[PDB]
Amino acid sequence: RLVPGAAYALYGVWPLLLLLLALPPRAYA
């Protein structure tokens, strides 16, 4: 029902931490 940000940042932050958990270095290594 169009959340007021409550279910927006929480949903857009999981993939960021997921990206950070498997984030590669600037030189790939």
Angstrom CA distances, 22 to 3, 4, 8, stand at 29, 30, 22
Q: What are phi and psi of 16, to 5 degrees?
A: -70, -45
Structure tokens at 28: 């790939």
* Determination approach: NMR
Segments in 1-29 forming alpha helices (H):
6-21
